[PDB]
Design a protein around this ligand. Structure first.
Ligand SMILES: *C(=O)[C@@H](C(C)C)[C@H]1[C@H](NS(C)(=O)=O)CCN1C(=O)c1coc(CN2CCCC2)n1
Ligand SMILES: *C(=O)[C@@H](C(C)C)[C@H]1[C@H](NS(C)(=O)=O)CCN1C(=O)c1coc(CN2CCCC2)n1
Ligand SMILES: *[C@@H]1O[C@H](CO[C@@H]2O[C@@H](C)[C@@H](O)[C@@H](O)[C@@H]2O)[C@@H](O)[C@H](O)[C@H]1NC(C)=O
Ligand SMILES: *[C@@H]1O[C@H](CO[C@@H]2O[C@@H](C)[C@@H](O)[C@@H](O)[C@@H]2O)[C@@H](O)[C@H](O)[C@H]1NC(C)=O
Ligand SMILES: *[C@@H]1O[C@H](CO[C@@H]2O[C@@H](C)[C@@H](O)[C@@H](O)[C@@H]2O)[C@@H](O)[C@H](O)[C@H]1NC(C)=O
Ligand SMILES: *[C@@H]1O[C@H](CO[C@@H]2O[C@@H](C)[C@@H](O)[C@@H](O)[C@@H]2O)[C@@H](O)[C@H](O)[C@H]1NC(C)=O
Lengths: 218, 218
C-alpha cells in the first residue's frame, strides 16, 4: 500500500498473508474457518504445495504467537482469464480449520448481485510494496479510497484515492477491499504503475461470485 | 505411452496437445468447439499465457497443416487438491472456435455418475515417453488397457495392463481414457514409476464431473 497508514494490531482479523519460502507474496481473506479467498493470479504460476496460509498476522517481521498457519487443500476457480485478469478470484480450502478468536475471524460477504456506485467509501489493505523506496511492508497497512466507475470495466469494482498519488501495490494483490463492512473486492490489477494518480485500482467484484462461493463453503 | 502402438492418423480427432513455445507437455480433450478439458496439475506451474492448445495433430516432429492452434481465454477448476491429485480436472475456454472437420471433432461424454466396473476394456493414448529408452513420442500412441478397482481410489478410474510392463508416462498426463466410445478418464498419475506392472494407472473420473462441465459449456 502506497501512502496509507499502519493498522491497529489485529483490526482486521479476517486478513490473511500468503507466503512461499519465508516471504509474503499476496494477501487473502478468511471467509470460513477452513476457507480463504484471493486473486486467481496469485496462485497461477507458483508451487501451490509450498504455499503457507498465515492467519492472525499483524507484523510479518516479528514472531507472532497469534498466528495460525495452514496449507492449501483444494482449489476452485470459475472462468479466470489469464490474458486480461477477468474473474480474478480463487477459493482455497485449507488443510484444517481456524480457531475463531480475537485475532482470527471470518469476514462477511455482500449479497449476490449487489452493485457499488461511484462515491462509496471503502478501505483497502495489504502488506504490499510501500512504493519502490523501501520494499515490502512489515506492518499491515490500510488506505481510505473511494469507489469509482470512470475508467473501470463493468466486470470490476474500482477505487481511487482522490487528490494524491496513493493506492495498492505489488504484494497487495489478493487482499480484500472492505466497504460498509462486507468484502466487496479482492485486489487484482493497477495501471500506469502503482499509485499513478491517473488510473483507478481494479478489484475483482466479489458480489458477482456470491452464489458460486456459497455453493462451495456452505 | 510405454508399450503401446502408433495410432492411426487422425484416428482420434478430439485428441489435443498442450504446448509451451512449441513444446508438448500434456494432452487434453476437445469437449466443445471452444472448450478442452485436461488435468488441473498440467497447468499448475506454467505461465498459461504462453500455452498453446493444438488441435488436429498427429506427428509432433512434423509441420502439419491439419493443425488448429488456440490460446486459453478462461479457466475453471472444482476442488483440485494439489497435494494428492484428487479432482485433477481443469476446463479451458479457448480464444476462438475450432473448425469441425475430419481432423478435429468434439468427443462424447458419459452421463453424470456413470461408473465403470472391474474388467471393462478401454483405450489410453497420448504423446508421452516411450518407456525410459527413446524419449517422448513423435507419433500419437495408443494402448489397450483394463479398468480395475484394486489399488485404486473410489475417486479415480484406474487401469492396468496385465502380463507385461505397459502404461502412461510423462507427457500423457491430461490425455483422455476412452471406454465404449465415451471419455471416462483424464490421465492423472502413476505409482511405482511408469509401467511398473505393479500399480494401476489413475485417471480423473470424468463422469463424476459431467453436471459441472455441462454448466460451463452450456
Ligand atoms: C497484484 O499485486 C497486482 C496489482 C494489484 C499490484 C499486480 C500483479 N502483478 S505482479 C508484477 O505479480 O505483482 C498482477 C497485476 N499487477 C500489476 O502490478 C500490474 C501491472 O500491470 C497491470 C495491469 N494489467 C494486467 C491486467 C490488464 C493490464 N497490473
Ligand atoms: C502425468 O504426466 C503424470 C502421469 C500420468 C505420468 C505425472 C505428472 N507429474 S509430472 C508431468 O512428471 O511432473 C503428475 C504425476 N505424474 C507422475 O509421474 C507421478 C509421479 O508420482 C506420482 C504419484 N503421486 C501423485 C498422486 C500422489 C503421489 N504421479
Ligand atoms: C496444515 O498445514 C500446516 C503447515 O504445514 C507446514 O507447511 C506446509 C505448507 C507444509 O510445508 C508442511 O509440510 C509444513 O510442516 C501443518 O503444520 C499443520 O499441522 C496442518 N494441519 C493439519 C493437517 O491438521
Ligand atoms: C477512513 O476509514 C475509516 C473506516 O471506514 C469504515 O470502515 C471500513 C471497515 C469500511 O467498512 C468502510 O466502508 C467504512 O467507511 C473511518 O473510520 C475514517 O473515518 C476514514 N477517514 C476518512 C478521512 O475518510
Ligand atoms: C487465438 O490464439 C492464437 C494463438 O496465438 C499464439 O499463441 C498464443 C498463446 C499467443 O502466444 C499468441 O500471441 C501466439 O501467436 C492466435 O494465433 C489466433 O489468431 C487467436 N485467434 C483469435 C483471437 O480469434
Ligand atoms: C483394443 O481396443 C480396441 C478399441 O477398443 C474399443 O474402442 C475404445 C476406444 C474404447 O471405447 C474401448 O472400450 C473399446 O473396446 C479394440 O477394438 C481391440 O479389439 C482391443 N484389442 C484387445 C486385444 O483388447
Amino acid at each position: 500500500i502506497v501512502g496509507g497508514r499502519r493498522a491497529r494490531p489485529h483490526a482486521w482479523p479476517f486478513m490473511v498473508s500468503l507466503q512461499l519460502r519465508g516471504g509474503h507474496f499476496c494477501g487473502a481473506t478468511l471467509i470460513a474457518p477452513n476457507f480463504v479467498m484471493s486473486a486467481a493470479h496469485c496462485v497461477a504460476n507458483v508451487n501451490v504445495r509450498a504455499v503457507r496460509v498465515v492467519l492472525g498476522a499483524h507484523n510479518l517481521s516479528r514472531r507472532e504467537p497469534t498466528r495460525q498457519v495452514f496449507a492449501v487443500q483444494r482449489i476452485f476457480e470459475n472462468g479466470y482469464d489469464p490474458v486480461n485478469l477477468l474473474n480474478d478470484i480463487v477459493i482455497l480450502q485449507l488443510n484444517g480449520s481456524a480457531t475463531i478468536n480475537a485475532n482470527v475471524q471470518v469476514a462477511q460477504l455482500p449479497a449476490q448481485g449487489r452493485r457499488l456506485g461511484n462515491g462509496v467509501q471503502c478501505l483497502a489493505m495489504g502488506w504490499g510494496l510501500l512504493g519502490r523506496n523501501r520494499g515490502i511492508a512489515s506492518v499491515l497497512q490500510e488506505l481510505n479510497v473511494t469507489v469509482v466507475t470512470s475508467l473501470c470495466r463493468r466486470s470490476n469494482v474500482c477505487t481511487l484515492v482522490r487528490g494524491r498519488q496513493a493506492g495498492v501495490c505489488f504484494g497487495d494483490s489478493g487482499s480484500p477491499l472492505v466497504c460498509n463492512g462486507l468484502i466487496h473486492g479482492i485486489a487484482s490489477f493497477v495501471r500506469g504503475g502503482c499509485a499513478s494518480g491517473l488510473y483507478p485500482d481494479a478489484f475483482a467484484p466479489v458480489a458477482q461470485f456470491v452464489n458460486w462461493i456459497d455453493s462451495i463453503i456452505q
